[PDB]
């Protein structure tokens, strides 16, 4: 069906106007908790609980902060300076009508609470509020996170690897 | 007696008007919590706890989201667009007067909160409110979820399987 | 002393007027939580804590739902239709003045909350409110639940068992 | 020092007027939680927190219900009928001025909440309220619970034991 | 006394209604491990060991798989399709009140774990679960496994054996 | 000193009232594992090792099942039906104050787990649980297991032995 | 650095006027939770959260009650009768200006809640309120709890120890 | 990326005016929980949740107390006397524009709650409030906590170490 | 160096006040397993493993039960009745400062688990718990176990030995 | 097929950038344990085994430490200083498509645990972790370990060997 | 290469300031097990196994206790009194840059568990913890354990040896 790796959250800044959708890697658990309230009276009857309510949809997105890769710096530009976020919930599996699919929203951060442990690495917890989801199922997701994530390790170069962990470079 | 597999929740959309009852497969745990309040005074006596109250009956239905099989798209059509759900709580064991039996209701979703983990696959949690259950024990349940769930694995075809996991197809 | 099996709850419907006391089989844990409040002041003194209060006695009765045996349908006739319950808390050990003994009450259900799991079987939780217990220790409990619970297994019939789990029947 | 077995709770009914102090056998964990409030002020200063408050002292006494031995029936005479309790907190170690010592009070039950499990035996939880502790350290505790608890098992009588668990009887 | 050959496990299907009791030959070791739990308590006393427990009685039955002889096909019909087993622990020695004697049960399989080695022959391990054994000393055990197991081999047929290993047939 | 044959376990049923003490023939190894717990604490000190604990003394009693000799049927009456055991750990050597000496207890069985092998004979493992051992050094042990165990074999009766293995009977 | 043993709480009664500082031994975990509030506004700005607040400093002191050693009787004289406590938080490590050091205060007990378990020994929990800590780092701590805690065990006296656990006495 | 060791909190007093940034060693877990509220109405619409709110950013900084190293005494000068703190959140990894980078703030302590256990060492918990973070990424961090944390153990001096744990001194 | 015979465990009762140190004959393997805990920390550093822990020192003392020689009855007086033991770990070789040397303690028994085998003799396992070993090198060990153990056997007494196995007595 | 000598692990440092691939000689047992997790779920169905898992492949590489040959010094530079390893699993037999073949990775050491025995020589155990193996079948393996391993020893040099064990050098 | 005799563990006290390095003779097996933990993450990727962890390096040092030779008395001064150890892992083979080489540390003892057998001699097991090993290759190891260990035995002195086992002294 749909795995815990099959869904990722493409983020886009309000000020770039560049069609790339930088999602930030090293994810963790997530959440799109869609809380829709509802009217209730009794009418001296069994109840009138059928009535609708306003929908407030939150997001608990957790990840790990890498030392560069300024998409999270755009997240902190949205939070600490004060902006909003173009928010995309896209999938990894291939559809046959579109390429992928999504739940879309213009989101605003409640809180950016990150833990700095001792043995565990740091983890950024981020809350989200959005007005209402919008099912903008689209096609191009700029595939640097779907097929690009292949093995981690690359092939070799015996005289000239000149590399730490993140593999595959020319000598100097 | 009745096992944790012996009870499933047949759903039907308000707009289909089609007698098929699409329940959505790949379930998880459930809940039909029937909270009925009660008038309580003391009357300068031991109490008047005998008095009835209004019944508000909720449902915590959890499952896993499959990439197709649009019954859950009818769930999200009822939630996100805003509709109601024809709700059926049917059993799997065979009765001797009817075929199966049920607790019935016209239900309305509070919240659709799904978790996107990392190692575990995604899980959809859904809350339900219903006015009052109605014991419409009926017969036909369109048996694609009672006897049809048999083994998962199918027989073989050695020169011509041409199949991934979900078995049993012709070569093209 | 008194074991966790030594106490069972004989139930009786308000409309049967039948002297049998059908308790329901396949129990789980229970609880008779007797919450009595108290007149609590200070009176410019150490306190007037000695004063009594109203007694509200609840019960958390859990069991497993069996596919027949309509005593639980009498429970649901008391709950969902709206009635009351004749409630008996009897013991299994043999007294020397009476046969058994009891804590008695006319009870009313708050809530009927059952869980439908996946691997665990379904479990019915039921809350109870009663005005006040009454020590009607009586004799006859119709012993189909005291001595009749003996082994589960019966002897055999090799050419003629014709039986599934619950043993001991004639050939058709 | 003082063990968890070294402290037991001698109880006495208000209506017996008999000097025996029936404590109940087969106890469980306990608690004498002494909550004394205090005048909490500031007085445009660092605080006036030195001021005293009223003392409300509770007791969470748990035990297991034996099928006879009517001391617990005197507890239920204090609770279900409605009375008060003469409450003694005595020790097991031998003093050199007295025999034993105690914290004393006239107590009143909040609640009698007992759990009836399935495999675990039943356990009676009892709450207590007292005006104020009083250090009436006395001598005689009627030693059927200090030195009498020795082994449980007794010696034998091979042609004539005629006994179940609790040993040491004559043949009929 | 009683040897390791003196006890064999006669099996019977729930669906046959045939008085034959097919045990399956080529046995290996067995086990009827009767784990009855208990309430061990401390009670500010020496202890409250009196508490009985539920009896969970398992069976480690190992044997060798023969290419026919459909008793093990009835075992796999009870396991893989999902049924139960009429279980018999009978003895080989001759009693004087009955013919033989037994510990009886209605069993359900935990696991059917068989080892396919290389040079050792294949061996089937089967776990068993029963509510409670029942001392059903009976007489007829269809003696094809008490007296009929005599040598393995037979005497001779010098002109007209015409057989493989297991001797004693007419020529074609 | 004391050999592994010098200590045997005389048993007695709770219902017999017969001074015989049936121990069982063809014993195997034993065990009286006396686990007394303790309070070990630290107290911002070196330790609070002073605390005694409850003593739970188990027994691993193994033997071989003989086809009669109903002392093991008294064991299975204590276990499979549900009773207790009068338990005796007596010695074989002669004392000068008494005849023999013992550690005594009232025991309750955890488990009765016997192995049915193939070539080794069957062996019964029995777990035991007692409140506390009691040093009841007594005299009479009904000497059919101290001096009577001499050889097994006897001399002869050349015309009229007419016996199987266990020798020494009259002709028919 | 500072161990969990390196800090102990020297207590002194208000009525003794004796320079000995009886702390009570057999400690357990502790706590000096210093809750200082703060002026909390916004002032149509980012906030005025810089502003100070009143300090309320509590102490969760847990220990085990020894049968004598009346420093805890001075604690119960402060609580149950109603007094105050001179409170010292001193260290065990040696300083090079002073001997030891302290966080000091005049404290008042909220609550004295002790648990009487079954297998665990009793444990006294005590809450503390103090106006404000005062750093009266002093020298003499009457070293019977710093260097005197050495091993617990003492040397011997083979004809004349005459002692239980707490060692080292003359013969009577 | 960024490890749990890669971020440390450089502290500076308001009164020193010394460019050293004494952070206190022996850290534990941390936290910079940035709680920013938001304007919340509905306007007879889907909602006006887009509106910003005030940011209150807290810090849970835990560490272990060392017997000297008076930076924590400057923390206690800020708390117990009443001052403020210059607060730096710097990274350990090397940047290529600056040396390191930081999140800065002028902070004020809510509470200083430390635990004194028995087996575990003491642990200081400290809460922080700050108006707003300021991204003052600077260069020099006085590298006695970035490179100087190398091994702990030093080389040797066999005739003349004269040292306890923290190694490397001259003889006297 | 030091052989397995060179170290023996002299015991002394708490109630005897007799300078004899009864050790027991026919010892078996031993053990003084000194488990001292420690503080294990990481501290955003290489570690703060420095922390000492409490020392909990056990003893696995195994021997063979001789039918008399009541030192083991003093052990069973310490265990089964409930007392403590004066514990001695002395050596056999001669020193030049003292006669012998020792590691000393005051011990308390966890468990007394002895095996009653069949063909091996019985063996007693005893667990020990001590606060802290103390290096009490002393002189006199009452030499009936250092020099007296030479052969067991003696030379002869041809007319009048009149002895069983352990030789050397007068006629009658 | 493939023997236990036919596979060797070529190692390369991250800092060398020299095309030599130093494996370290005197191998012992190895291991590439490829642990790929999975999602096994139940779904009120037969199961949902479809879920892939992350793959964590470990290496148990054991060898013997030679006194020089600095490849193991590069291992200890990766472990004790802290680096990573370019990891190679190559084969010894000659292929016809390439020269040799391999499973490749970028590895990081868990532990370096070596045993220093007495009568056996020392042995180094090393654990390995890799993100993902990659099938990099390549050609050149610098043949000092494929064809060069011929005997260990050489033929002879009768006058002028002048060598220790490892033969074949010029005089001086 | 390197034999099990080629590596020995030179010890030095923290209080001596004597350049001698007393190792203790009669070694047995050893161990320096270097457990360095790591961050193990999945990150909706192939993994983030990259994270370094803290190194906890232990030592299992076993030897035989000689009756003098106070190096082990310095070990017991570190354990039983409470100190630390200067720890040396040096090699026996000769280098050409230095004489020998080492892995060095400052160690603290977990446990000192020694076995006192019967027919085998005693053996001491000692556990070690160190912050971090440091590669301190040095020259002088006080060669009384590298070259001086030659045979054990010496040549002769035929009239005037006058010695026990370890030979080579003057007459008297």
Curated annotation (Swiss-Prot), chains A, B, C, D, E, F, G, H, I, J, K:
Metal-binding found in the keyword field: no
PTM section of the record: The tail tube is formed by the proteins gp17.1 and gp17.1* at a ratio of about 3:1.
Which terms are listed as keywords in the entry?
Viral genome ejection through host cell envelope, Viral long flexible tail ejection system, Viral penetration into host cytoplasm, Viral tail protein, Viral tail tube protein, Virion, Virus entry into host cell
Subcellular localization, as worded in the UniProt entry: Virion
Q: Quick one: a GO biological-process term for this protein?
A: viral head-tail joining
Which Gene Ontology cellular component annotation is one that this UniProt entry carries? virus tail, tube
Q: Which domain of life is it from?
A: Viruses
Q: How does it assemble?
A: Homohexamer. Self-assembles into a long sixfold helical tube. SPP1 virion tails are composed of about 40 stacked rings, and each tail ring is rotated by about 21 degrees relative to the previous one. Interacts with the tail completion protein gp17.
Summary of the function given for this chain in its UniProt record: Forms the 160 nm long, sixfold helical, rigid tail tube. Binding to the entry receptor triggers structural rearrangements of the tail tube leading to ejection of the phage DNA into the host.
Stated name of the protein = Tail tube protein gp17.1*
């Amino acid at each position: 069906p749909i795995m815990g790796q099959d869904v990722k959250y493409l983020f886009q800044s309000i000020d770039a106007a560049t069609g790339s959708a930088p999602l930030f890697p090293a994810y963790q658990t997530d959440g799109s908790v869609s809380g829709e309230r509802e009217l209730f009276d009794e009418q001296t009857k069994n109840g009138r609980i059928l009535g609708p309510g306003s929908v407030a949809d939150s997001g608990e997105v957790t990840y790990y902060g890498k030392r560069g890769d300024a998409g999270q710096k755009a997240i902190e530009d949205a939070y600490q300076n004060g902006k909003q976020i173009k928010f995309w919930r896209v999938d990894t599996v291939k559809n046959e009508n579109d390429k992928y699919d999504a739940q879309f929203g213009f989101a605003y951060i409640e809180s950016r609470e990150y833990s700095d442990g001792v043995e565990g690495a740091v983890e950024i917890s981020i809350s989200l509020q959005v007005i209402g989801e919008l099912k903008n199922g689209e096609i191009d997701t700029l595939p640097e996170e779907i097929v690009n994530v292949s093995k981690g390790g690359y092939d070799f170069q015996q005289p000239g690897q000149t590399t730490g962990e993140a593999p595959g470079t020319v000598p100097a």
